[PDB]
Design a protein that fits this description.
Oligomer: homodimer
EC number (chains A, B): 2.2.1.1
Function (chains A, B): Catalyzes the transfer of a two-carbon ketol group from a ketose donor to an aldose acceptor, via a covalent intermediate with the cofactor thiamine pyrophosphate.
Shape of chain A: elongated
CATH architecture of the largest domain in chain A: 3-Layer(aba) Sandwich
Organism (chains A, B): Scheffersomyces stipitis (strain ATCC 58785 / CBS 6054 / NBRC 10063 / NRRL Y-11545)
Distance between the termini of chain A: 63 Å
Largest interface: A-B, 121 and 121 residues
Protein name (chains A, B): Transketolase
Number of helices of chain A: 25
CATH topology of the largest domain in chain A: Rossmann fold
Number of strands of chain A: 20
Helix content of chain A: 40-55%
Catalytic activity (chains A, B): D-sedoheptulose 7-phosphate + D-glyceraldehyde 3-phosphate = aldehydo-D-ribose 5-phosphate + D-xylulose 5-phosphate
């Protein structure tokens, strides 16, 4: 009868019809959460005609399988998504994929579906919003005062990544974050009683969250709206709103785990429509009264943005410096000549570990580039990720930092750090944010890292202690598979810089990135500055370090093994073998160079040996023979481990000589060549 | 003055001296936890001369960086570890690596160090102990009544994997588990106040854990012992014992985060020794009164084991069937001819998805092999991991199952499922345990999976929905990098079976495994039974499916792409090209075959094309050219996705023809050949 009721029914039936058209997808949660979605979007400020408005409230569907729900909202509010797109739910080439993709779906802030991720992304959006507001807001100029709204399900609450992020969100007193738990007592295996009996509310209170409970979230949208208002009044705690719902509300199978992930039966859909006043013979129906009511909210929001645009214009006049910086960031541009701050080295400079070179880079570029923030997962004094003179990101009320701070104490929470980094990037305003841990424990965060790549987010991992080079901590800490794993993931730039100049190139890439996450693999041990390295050469991803016109062999290497390759070249000289050396600091950047550039670095007609003290996987793209480490490491002094595995000038030279012998009297084509 | 005091001091100074000798490692937690370690080991039943006694209490050092502490205990109790081994702490080739390794260190139940893992391993040990006791205990025959003791630090409590496992341990009412939190207010970054302010105790109560707090765990070993007794009285809740300690107790830097991970200064070590009555000029001192007191506890424990051995002997007489089964499992042997239960298929059988073939295998072998237990991370109706007629593992008090049950409801907790699986394997008694999820979300558990490999634990992942073949769920669910990641990890068998016979071979491998974790990559889509497949052929890891003496090309493939390769062979026939087909269901099993077997499958003198609908990484070990998918997937009907990416008989045949052309008039050697 009310237009709110009609809208809720419309949302539910659009979602059910999308799933029916695909004969695939999940109608249960969309049916149970449509009342909450309606209430939340009515409280949100957003512009369907400007999905990038920096002061929009953000919505994250963390239970992303429910995405027919998200798409229905975006269609009804006039985003660049139509009923015809809904009819193509889960079909190849459509803008309505089975789980929302921020690269494809207008109004999808992040890519969700893998459970636990969205809520952590929302923590990051709210973290960025707090940092952004603390940086730019002035008296009478609330440039940023937006909220982050997250829908999540029981599964999200079982995933450890969400515990990590919720502990940290409570610690950070993020009162700009409002999360909604779909408390429907059903997961995929059946009742939550079989595996999930914890006192969720008590746990969230233990993190410092504020709680509002809505006992009838099936129908009481007034209570949902009041819970939002109450959440906003509690400015020093993130709020969890418990929505007690009936999964699949209205279905003959409502409240049972059948409605979870299977299209409804035809007769079920027919009785749904009839009892709510819709035509059972019609699909994808949109009552004009619903879109009119929604259009009114859009019009109010567009007026709010217009007033915000005038506020921003007045801000730029009263604070021309801050206003120009803000305009620049909103345009997606770094400061002019920011890269003049990158340090440059020569072979007369001392040997330095690349974790220490990384600390130096950050010390130089953080003052120059305000949109850089980052932190470490409780390894700040080992990753060397904090630039002296910056303040930690903390609620001012704690005395430990300020929301304008730029260094984040993630604690021992690698996975959530990864997903929060995705949320900070997703906020926009050109944030270029980073997170430090040991390379071997980036793997803890694999779920989020692959979503960085799929989402095209320019986040950066500062991943130190990259190999057996770390020594005594031993094989539980020493990467073997790690670079192969992320190099095999599409759209990850995996930098393993060999020296000072290469480390500057890696940061030049990571900070200028707009669509590609970075992992910087950095050493504990000191490496010499190379003859022939430079920022601009290393910026090609792969380059000729030692050019040898009459090469018997080219040794291609990365990181700490480039200096090793050069030392092996000298041993080979003594044997009358002429070797060239290629440094390959990033395979992805190299791969995207022109074919003729790539073939000049790895030409035809010379055998190529790769040297890297980790897995040989991937290396046949660039080499004919691979010298690597395909077993776990060992606890001991690093030089002794290298000796044991013959990663020595003589050990490399021996294998280079055997590689030359292997191909003697056979002509060889570049490993870059492919039959198709 | 007391011998308890002298023992605590001995433990502390052995740990400090080990770190000093290495000039590497962490003295803080060993100093703070030595009183608790002393108290706990005095309450434990164990035999240093039989580390495999099945009714021993288990100890897990989850804060594994503290392992100088563990080694000191093992030395003082006369395990196969000596003071001379301690002097070689963190040295290459020693039995005292920087983090404990169950493969190397007598008395190390699991490999710890990566934070969060050990406590989850302890949940698994206790889960296995409950299941084992419920299976075999009889009236007057308490065959199994052992406890699991875990030490953990603040970092472990921040890692999401430990939240997952602690939620589940509370749900499972595991009163045989006692965990001790080193509440010392310090992590690597400094005070826990900067990132970890949650009410830990309230959170653990919310999971259903019992709490005992020891306010002075620096000195009150009577309170620690009473907390253990109180924990044992609470049989229906796991217990968390809060140990409030001074990190680095006794050091000049005690209670500061300097003592965390750096060797103490020489003068600090000297004042430590003097004030506790030791010689500052002596290192690795062991007062005879301490080892005498410890020897007395060993003697009592050996008497307990001797009585247990007599109890077992009487058990075998009264229950010859159960007793023979138990003896068999303790001997590490599967039932005779267990593999007669594996199903065998022919090409006259219908096409079946390998997730469904997997369900059939489990239905046949679970009744035959009692040491198989497993579960799913809330994907039981999609993984098809439960054999009908089994009961869930649950406390009888819940009405949802029994501790004798064999199917585990892990909930949406992939990472903890992985580490709990490691603990179940670590318990011993020949447990062969498994866990199901989508292949793409095995990656959530990467931290634990790599420890499965490093620990040599025969755990099994039942990893369904292995590729774009799953269709509509789209690229957030579709593996690309996943197999490359785990194939690049040493010691993981990664099975991707093509049909019914191959799926039986994969389980034959996974269940007979004693030292190698398995991942079974299984399809949602139906695949035909192959002409030429068999269990015994597929058990070679790689084999010739279609032998072609005059091959122009060999197509090597896995899983769903083997049938594709055969269809492409038929297209190629029409073009006058003769192709052979190799099926490579497990690369690791294949790699370990003899050189001459491997060369008969992938011989010299014929170009080899690989076909697999995921990353091409690793494939150059077996092929000259690789047809794979090195971009993310798409949401749509699977056949349309395959068509789009040209994974069709014609698309493969085209690339096979171009591969033949590429090598025309050049003789080719097997990709297996290497120069060194």
């Amino acid at each position: 009868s009310s237009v709110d009721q009609k809208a809720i029914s419309t949302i539910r039936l659009l979602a059910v019809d999308a799933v029916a058209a695909a004969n695939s997808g999940h109608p249960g949660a969309p049916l149970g959460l449509a009342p909450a979605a309606h209430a939340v979007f009515k409280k949100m400020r957003f512009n369907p005609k400007d999905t990038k408005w920096i002061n929009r409230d953000r919505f994250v569907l963390s239970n992303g399988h429910a995405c027919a729900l998200l798409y229905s909202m975006l269609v009804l509010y006039g985003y660049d998504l139509t009923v015809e797109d809904l009819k193509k739910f889960r079909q190849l080439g459509s803008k309505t994929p089975g789980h929302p993709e921020n690269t494809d779906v207008p109004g999808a802030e992040v890519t969700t579906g893998p459970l636990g991720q969205g809520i952590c992304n929302g923590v990051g959006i709210a973290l960025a919003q707090a940092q952004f507001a603390a940086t730019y807001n002035k008296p009478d100029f609330p440039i940023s005062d937006s909220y982050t709204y997250v829908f999540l399900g029981d599964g999200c609450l079982m995933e450890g990544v969400s515990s990590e992020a919720s502990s940290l969100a409570g610690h950070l007193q993020l009162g700009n974050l409002i999360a909604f738990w779909d408390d429907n007592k059903i997961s995929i295996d059946g009742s939550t009683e079989v595996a999930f009996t914890e006192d969720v509310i008590a746990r969230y209170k233990s993190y410092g969250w504020h709680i509002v409970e809505v006992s009838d979230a099936d129908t009481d949208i007034t209570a949902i709206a009041a819970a939002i208002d109450e959440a906003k009044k509690v400015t020093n705690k993130p709020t969890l709103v418990r929505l007690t719902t009936t999964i699949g509300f209205g279905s003959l199978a409502q409240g049972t785990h059948g409605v979870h992930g299977a299209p409804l039966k035809a007769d079920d859909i027919k009785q749904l429509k009839t009892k709510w006043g819709f035509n059972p013979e019609e699909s994808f129906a949109v009552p004009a009264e619903v879109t009119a009511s929604y259009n009114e909210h859009v019009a109010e929001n567009q007026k709010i943005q217009q007033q915000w645009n005038e506020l921003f214009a007045a801000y730029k006049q009263k604070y021309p410096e801050l206003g120009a910086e803000l305009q620049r960031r909103l345009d997606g541009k770094l400061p002019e000549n920011w890269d003049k701050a990158l340090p440059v080295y020569t072979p007369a400079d001392a040997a330095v570990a690349t974790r220490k070179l990384s600390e130096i880079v950050l010390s130089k570029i953080i003052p120059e580039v305000p949109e850089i923030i980052g932190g470490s997962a409780d390894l700040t004094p080992s990753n060397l990720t904090k630039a002296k003179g910056t303040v930690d990101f903390q609620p001012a009320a704690t005395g430990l930092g300020d929301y304008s701070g730029r260094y984040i104490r993630y604690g021992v929470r690698e996975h959530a750090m990864g997903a929060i980094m995705n949320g900070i990037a997703a906020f926009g305003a050109n944030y270029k944010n980073y997170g430090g841990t040991f390379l071997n424990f980036v793997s803890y965060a694999a779920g989020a890292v692959r979503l960085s790549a799929l989402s095209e987010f320019p986040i950066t991992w500062v991943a130190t202690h990259d190999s057996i080079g770390l020594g005594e901590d031993g094989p539980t800490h020493q990467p073997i598979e790690t670079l192969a794993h992320f190099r095999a993931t599409p759209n990850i730039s995996v930098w393993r810089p060999a020296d000072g100049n290469e480390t500057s190139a890696a940061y030049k890439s990571a900070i200028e990135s707009t669509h590609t996450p970075h992992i910087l693999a950095l050493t504990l041990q000191n490496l010499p500055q190379l003859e022939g390295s430079s920022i601009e050469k290393a910026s090609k991803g792969g380059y000729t370090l030692v050019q040898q016109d009459k090469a018997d062999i080219i040794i291609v290497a990365t990181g700490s093994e480039v200096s090793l390759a050069v030392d092996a070249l000298k041993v080979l000289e003594g044997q009358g073998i002429k070797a060239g050396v290629v440094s390959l600091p990033d395979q992805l950047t190299f791969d995207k160079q022109s074919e003729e550039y790539k073939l000049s670095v790895l030409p035809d007609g010379v055998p190529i040996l790769s040297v890297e003290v980790m897995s040989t996987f991937g290396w046949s793209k660039y080499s004919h023979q691979q010298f690597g480490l395909n077993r776990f490491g060992a606890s001991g002094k690093a030089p002794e481990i290298f000796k044991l595995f013959e990663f020595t000038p003589e050990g490399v030279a021996e294998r280079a000589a055997k590689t030359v012998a292997f191909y003697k009297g056979k002509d060889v084509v570049s490993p870059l060549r492919s039959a198709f």
